[PDB]
Amino acid sequence: MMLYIVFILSVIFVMGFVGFSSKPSPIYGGLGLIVSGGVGCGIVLNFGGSFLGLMVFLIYLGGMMVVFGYTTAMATEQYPEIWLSNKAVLGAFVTGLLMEFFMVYYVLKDKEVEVVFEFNGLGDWVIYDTGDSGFFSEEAMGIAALYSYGTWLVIVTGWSLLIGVVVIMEITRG
Amino acid sequence: MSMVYMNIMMAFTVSLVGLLMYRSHLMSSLLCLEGMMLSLFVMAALTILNSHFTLASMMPIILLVFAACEAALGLSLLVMVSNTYGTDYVQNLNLLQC
Amino acid sequence: KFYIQEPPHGSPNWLKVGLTLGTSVFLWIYLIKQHNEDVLEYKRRNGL
Amino acid sequence: PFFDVQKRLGVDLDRWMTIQSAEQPHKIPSRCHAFEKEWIECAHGIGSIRAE
Amino acid sequence: RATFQFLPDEARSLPPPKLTDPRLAFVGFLGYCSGLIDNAIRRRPVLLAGLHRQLLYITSFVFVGYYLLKRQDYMYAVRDHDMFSYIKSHPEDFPEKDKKTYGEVFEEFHPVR
Amino acid sequence: YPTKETAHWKPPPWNDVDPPKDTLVSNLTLNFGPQHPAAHGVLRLVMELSG
Amino acid sequence: LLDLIWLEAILPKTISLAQMKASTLVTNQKGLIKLYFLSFLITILISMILFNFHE
Amino acid sequence: AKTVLRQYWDIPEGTECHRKTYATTSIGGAAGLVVSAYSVALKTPTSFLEGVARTGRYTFTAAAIGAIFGLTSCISAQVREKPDDPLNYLIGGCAGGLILGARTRSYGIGAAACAYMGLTAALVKMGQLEGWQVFAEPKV
Amino acid sequence: LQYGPLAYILGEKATKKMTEKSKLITVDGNICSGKSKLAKEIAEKLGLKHFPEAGIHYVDSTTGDGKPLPVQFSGNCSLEKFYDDPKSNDGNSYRLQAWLYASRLLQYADALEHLLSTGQGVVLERSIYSDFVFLEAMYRQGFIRKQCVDHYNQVKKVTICEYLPPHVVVYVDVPVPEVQSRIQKKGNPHEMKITSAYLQDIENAYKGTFLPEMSEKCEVLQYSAWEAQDAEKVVEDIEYLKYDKGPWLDQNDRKLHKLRMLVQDKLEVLNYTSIPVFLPEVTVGAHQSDQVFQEFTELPGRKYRAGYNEDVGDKWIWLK
Amino acid sequence: MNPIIFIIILLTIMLGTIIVMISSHWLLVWIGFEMNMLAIIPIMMKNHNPRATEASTKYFLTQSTASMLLMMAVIINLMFSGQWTVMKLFNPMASMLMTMALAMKLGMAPFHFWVPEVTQGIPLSSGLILLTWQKLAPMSVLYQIFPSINLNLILTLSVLSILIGGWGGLNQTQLRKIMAYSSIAHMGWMTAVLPYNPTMTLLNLIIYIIMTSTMFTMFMANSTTTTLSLSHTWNKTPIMTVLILATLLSMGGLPPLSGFMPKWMIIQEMTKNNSIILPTFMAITALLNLYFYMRLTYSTTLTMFPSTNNMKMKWQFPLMKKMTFLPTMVVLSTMMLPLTPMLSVLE
Numbered sequence A: 001m002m003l004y005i006v007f008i009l010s011v012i013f014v015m016g017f018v019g020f021s022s023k024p025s026p027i028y029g030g031l032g033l034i035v036s037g038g039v040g041c042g043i044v045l046n047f048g049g050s051f052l053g054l055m056v057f058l059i060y061l062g063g064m065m066v067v068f069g070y071t072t073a074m075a076t077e078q079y080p081e082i083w084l085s086n087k088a089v090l091g092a093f094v095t096g097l098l099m100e101f102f103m104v105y106y107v108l109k110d111k112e113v114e115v116v117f118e119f120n121g122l123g124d125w126v127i128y129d130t131g132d133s134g135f136f137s138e139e140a141m142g143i144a145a146l147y148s149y150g151t152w153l154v155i156v157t158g159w160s161l162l163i164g165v166v167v168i169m170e171i172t173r174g
Numbered sequence B: 001m002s003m004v005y006m007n008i009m010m011a012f013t014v015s016l017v018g019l020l021m022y023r024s025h026l027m028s029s030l031l032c033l034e035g036m037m038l039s040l041f042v043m044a045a046l047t048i049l050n051s052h053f054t055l056a057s058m059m060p061i062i063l064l065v066f067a068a069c070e071a072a073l074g075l076s077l078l079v080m081v082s083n084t085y086g087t088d089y090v091q092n093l094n095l096l097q098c
Numbered sequence C: 001k002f003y004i005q006e007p008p009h010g011s012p013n014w015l016k017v018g019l020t021l022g023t024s025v026f027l028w029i030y031l032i033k034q035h036n037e038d039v040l041e042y043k044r045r046n047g048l
Numbered sequence D: 001p002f003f004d005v006q007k008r009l010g011v012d013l014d015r016w017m018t019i020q021s022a023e024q025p026h027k028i029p030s031r032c033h034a035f036e037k038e039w040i041e042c043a044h045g046i047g048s049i050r051a052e
Numbered sequence E: 001r002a003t004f005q006f007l008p009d010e011a012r013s014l015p016p017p018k019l020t021d022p023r024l025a026f027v028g029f030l031g032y033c034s035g036l037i038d039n040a041i042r043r044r045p046v047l048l049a050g051l052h053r054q055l056l057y058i059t060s061f062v063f064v065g066y067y068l069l070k071r072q073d074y075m076y077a078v079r080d081h082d083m084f085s086y087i088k089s090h091p092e093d094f095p096e097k098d099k100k101t102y103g104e105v106f107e108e109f110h111p112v113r
Numbered sequence F: 001y002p003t004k005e006t007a008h009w010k011p012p013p014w015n016d017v018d019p020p021k022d023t024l025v026s027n028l029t030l031n032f033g034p035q036h037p038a039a040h041g042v043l044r045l046v047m048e049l050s051g
Numbered sequence G: 001l002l003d004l005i006w007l008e009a010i011l012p013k014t015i016s017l018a019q020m021k022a023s024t025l026v027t028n029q030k031g032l033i034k035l036y037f038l039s040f041l042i043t044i045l046i047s048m049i050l051f052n053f054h055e
Numbered sequence H: 001a002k003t004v005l006r007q008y009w010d011i012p013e014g015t016e017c018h019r020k021t022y023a024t025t026s027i028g029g030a031a032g033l034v035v036s037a038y039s040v041a042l043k044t045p046t047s048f049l050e051g052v053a054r055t056g057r058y059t060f061t062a063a064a065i066g067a068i069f070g071l072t073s074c075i076s077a078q079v080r081e082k083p084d085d086p087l088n089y090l091i092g093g094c095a096g097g098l099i100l101g102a103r104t105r106s107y108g109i110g111a112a113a114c115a116y117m118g119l120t121a122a123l124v125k126m127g128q129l130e131g132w133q134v135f136a137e138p139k140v
Numbered sequence I: 001l002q003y004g005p006l007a008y009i010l011g012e013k014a015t016k017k018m019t020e021k022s023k024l025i026t027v028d029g030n031i032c033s034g035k036s037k038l039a040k041e042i043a044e045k046l047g048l049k050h051f052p053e054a055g056i057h058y059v060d061s062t063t064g065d066g067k068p069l070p071v072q073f074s075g076n077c078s079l080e081k082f083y084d085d086p087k088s089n090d091g092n093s094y095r096l097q098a099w100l101y102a103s104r105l106l107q108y109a110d111a112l113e114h115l116l117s118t119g120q121g122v123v124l125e126r127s128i129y130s131d132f133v134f135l136e137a138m139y140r141q142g143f144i145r146k147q148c149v150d151h152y153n154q155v156k157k158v159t160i161c162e163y164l165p166p167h168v169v170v171y172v173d174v175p176v177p178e179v180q181s182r183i184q185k186k187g188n189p190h191e192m193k194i195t196s197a198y199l200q201d202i203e204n205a206y207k208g209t210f211l212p213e214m215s216e217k218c219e220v221l222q223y224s225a226w227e228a229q230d231a232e233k234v235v236e237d238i239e240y241l242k243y244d245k246g247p248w249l250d251q252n253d254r255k256l257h258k259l260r261m262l263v264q265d266k267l268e269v270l271n272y273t274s275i276p277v278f279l280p281e282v283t284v285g286a287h288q289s290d291q292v293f294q295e296f297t298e299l300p301g302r303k304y305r306a307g308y309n310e311d312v313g314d315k316w317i318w319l320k
Numbered sequence J: 001m002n003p004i005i006f007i008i009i010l011l012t013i014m015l016g017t018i019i020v021m022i023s024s025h026w027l028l029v030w031i032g033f034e035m036n037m038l039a040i041i042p043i044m045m046k047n048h049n050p051r052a053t054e055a056s057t058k059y060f061l062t063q064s065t066a067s068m069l070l071m072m073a074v075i076i077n078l079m080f081s082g083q084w085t086v087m088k089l090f091n092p093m094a095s096m097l098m099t100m101a102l103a104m105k106l107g108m109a110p111f112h113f114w115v116p117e118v119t120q121g122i123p124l125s126s127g128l129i130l131l132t133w134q135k136l137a138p139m140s141v142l143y144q145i146f147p148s149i150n151l152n153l154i155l156t157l158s159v160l161s162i163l164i165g166g167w168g169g170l171n172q173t174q175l176r177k178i179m180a181y182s183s184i185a186h187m188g189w190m191t192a193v194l195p196y197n198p199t200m201t202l203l204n205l206i207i208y209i210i211m212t213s214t215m216f217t218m219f220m221a222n223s224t225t226t227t228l229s230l231s232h233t234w235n236k237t238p239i240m241t242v243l244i245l246a247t248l249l250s251m252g253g254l255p256p257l258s259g260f261m262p263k264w265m266i267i268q269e270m271t272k273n274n275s276i277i278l279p280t281f282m283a284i285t286a287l288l289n290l291y292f293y294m295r296l297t298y299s300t301t302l303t304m305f306p307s308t309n310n311m312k313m314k315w316q317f318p319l320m321k322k323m324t325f326l327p328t329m330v331v332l333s334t335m336m337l338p339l340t341p342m343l344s345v346l347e
Ligand SMILES: CCCCCCCCCCCCCCCCCC(=O)OC[C@H](COP(=O)(O)OCCN)OC(=O)CCCCCCCCCCCCCCCCC
Pocket: E033, E036, E037, E040, E044, E045, E046, E047, E048, J239
């Protein structure tokens, strides 16, 4: 059962996506995005990317905090909608879960599944590398190389973030 | 492909449909945009990490940076939409039919 | 007739006139020496 | 590239990260390094129509 | 042939366009017309006003046009060089025919009655 | 070409500016006291707040 | 019957009327973000299901 | 669409009309549904029931035009014993135009449809015979 | 450098030239209420530029050699004809009012350009902010149709929005019976035909709409007939005003730059005064328009851009 | 907007486009689009009114959606080839997603709905950038990925764009909406010939940009945004009505003007590949574009519309607008047909 850890987390990943994609009140959509960001961090971490997983979780927690503030200011109504409160929201929510549940049920039964394209259901561990014994994290070496190999990437990203500040000041100065 | 890809591709598709099927709140659609980027981050990270493409490990980080610039840009426009109409409803943005 | 407000182009802008004429002359000389250079290089490469 | 300024100026802007068999930090190889090297060297210079 | 070069070195083995090229005269004429339109939109005497400006219109057009015509000629030379070399490399795809005369070839006659 | 579905279309403003909506963003009204540490127990300060 | 009517009707007058009708169908829109993007979803779906543009 | 189109062109002209009429009806019905989907998406129906009403109205009209063209073109070929004559599609094409005119209660639409559909259908048969390419593969 | 973004980047910023004395002042009142004299004296005492009230031929005064042009080059709108026959079938009444507003809009732009580019304040006699009182008087007396009023409001709503109101609004309150006597003394035969009800309508608009509106955003001073007779007392009041309200407090170099780019571009200023709204009073047929336009270009120094007309002595055309 | 801030934002619009055109890596191509989208939005909102706000919002939602589909294609391509080089894609699903992603960025039908609305909601100077400069980056990508593009998909988009552009412009009185539908119609010609000869896509792109820049510059010179407002131009500046006439006839593709050149070279390439029906259909459908160009020439130059009395005040002031390059652009828009063989410079 533990050998299917990435699969289980990925099932919750989709459930969180169905959560905010059915579009209840953005308060609950933000909750669904936090769960997905949390388990998404768990998925990436299990492939050897501890830094990538924790970083995406950290970023999305900060982003959803702002979204929460903006929601109480600009996206609220008297009766915020939960998934059960609205017929369109419930229909999308149920449809997402049933599509998800049937993909899971059949991929587990046959150890394979055709959902448009063919996916193998042997368990995700089978593709992993078999021989590691370096004294470093390969993900950390690759990310740290941004400052030696990625000079060009550093410039365009740094410039875009500076322009981003300039732009949001322009956009919101009525 | 491996079974993890089934659910990550599914998550991207769910958010894409969520983006294309609007309701009223513009904030709800901006969330679906952020979700789409999250699935792309995870989907790209798995490929890069599993293939040991060392230098590509920075690519998902760069993806998040421009995700925030998009989210910040989206929220900026939401502020102006809200100021004009007092709601973030997308049915108010229909002046340009004529 | 005699303008109540002095026209912006009432008198020639001699700095621009000099630049404009100097640029036309410069470009013309550059074009001619290039063409002569190309003609000689062309004859050299083709054994003429 | 639509405009190959990188080649004209001999500056490397992004092609260092285009392939997984390019030079990596601390010479960490990708899992498919040999396979992609063999494919790249087979198809070098003959064009996609022939390489296909 | 050279990557992202306006005029590769090999283009110098071709003769440059003459400065009396009919195509270049037309380009110079377009510059003259541009100068006239510039006076007209700004409500200046069309023919007389700003002869320094009108001269620069003619000169800039001729300058740019000369290089465009040189690259134009170069690209057509390259096309033929490529085309003829390919024919030489593949004789069996461009075989010389046996040319029959009209006294041997049978063509059907269609009367106009 | 006039049609029934566009009978309600008006030409846009001459200078692109549509008039500002008369929508009222209501201030939040708050009972500050009487039962409040800073209200001295008997002050019902009715406050309108924007944020 | 011919020059002022039928030769006009079966060509210039019929063609120009059809174009006027099509112009109205194309341009009579609500300017609603919701409807335009809902049509993007339809375009993408028929692209894969009917025309197999993804193969 | 490629699968249904192939089926129509794989049973010879004038033979097995019922099979032909299924192919043209299948093509017509799909075209009607595509029209309904954009129409419902871009011009919202007032009620769910009406949106269904609009869908059935378009899908039936489209399918009728397909069936009548497939029926007429095959039956005319078999009767006339001229399987590979573009004229058969002209008869089928015009008949479709009449069905469209009838469904619209407009003679003028029926007249124009019988013509333009008549020519277009006859043009398709010539294209099949002579190999005219609409989306021609790049070659040179 | 001609003013533009480049000049602004290099230091041509309005905050450098503006002082406590850079003020826009408008003197308003009824007909024959002593505006001109008071406005001229305020300007001379304070060191400001005086703009005489914009008339039919104001635009002529700022272009060409500054002389009035023949009346066909203003539509033949006549103030005298308005007084004689305020219900003329040819729409002279509204055509005049539309022309006068545009002249005032241009004068306001010129005034703002002077204030921003030199820092010297100006004094105006009436303005685009107060021109509507004459339109209300015309409509209440039946001299113009309601359609003309609707047109006037359309033009105003897309033009007045672009400018800042005057710092100080001086108003001379002369009651109508005294005004009628003043007109009778002035001696213009056409002006004697003004009805008192029309004059009362001018006063009702001024007191009813103009001053209540200006109070919210400008310093307003109201002087009776006699108080106005000493401009020195008026100047004393202006010199001690607080200047604590209105939009001028909110301006900065970034906004005054954008404002200056507009007012210096006169065609941009006048853009919406000719909106394609076809009122009979202001619509001109193509044949009439073409003929008059051709005659206009045959005037001395009017065929070409200023400085390119050799018929009036411009030189170095071939180098300009 | 501070003048320095305006220049920095404009140079960032260009930098993002340049990055796309010089990048050999799909990630940097995506970054270029994102940087370009970030910078252009403040240009749309420059005047701050509800229509500018609506326009920018609709633009942001469309471009942001396209970028996600663009990045999806890149990642799918990475799974199935393990590289990032900008070239043909190695998965048909990736090719479709990228092709649709670029179609939405260009505003091709049936992803076209935003183009008329966004163009109408922003000033003329911003509209000029949107309908000209913003086409460069997506086209430069199509120019490199076309060997793997699905022919039926790309020709379907081209056909629909020409039809919808032609029909859409018939019902418009607003100049910005007329230019928008014209742009959609012209986009179809560029992509229709892309599978056969990418060099002809560049030619059409360049000539379309010159003609479109000329028209927008002339509309800006007179501050005209509607058909009736433009009909007063004969009374202000007669010369500008003749330039509009010549330019509009050129955009209609009439010989011997320059705008005929791209339609002519595209028909040649298509016929060389035994494509006869499609170019014929395209040329006839382009007559719809000529129709609503001809209406503008009628109301602008070939007749004299009623004027207003206040128009006389404008006679006394000169044109102050910069009108940068308009004398050059109009000549290029009209008098270039004799130099058609110069298209080999683009080879
Ligand atoms: C060897 C030369 C052969 C000539 C070939 C002509 C081909 C067309 C060239 C188009 C460019 C023309 C110049 C741009 C127009 C500027 C002229 C203008 O606006 O008005 C005429 C003007 C005289 O009026 P004015 O404004 O008062 O200026 C005083 C100066 N005397 O200025 C003038 O005095 C006259 C200036 C020329 C007037 C051109 C009139 C329009 C021609 C366009 C028709 C199409 C051309 C023929 C098509 C076949 C092309 C061969």
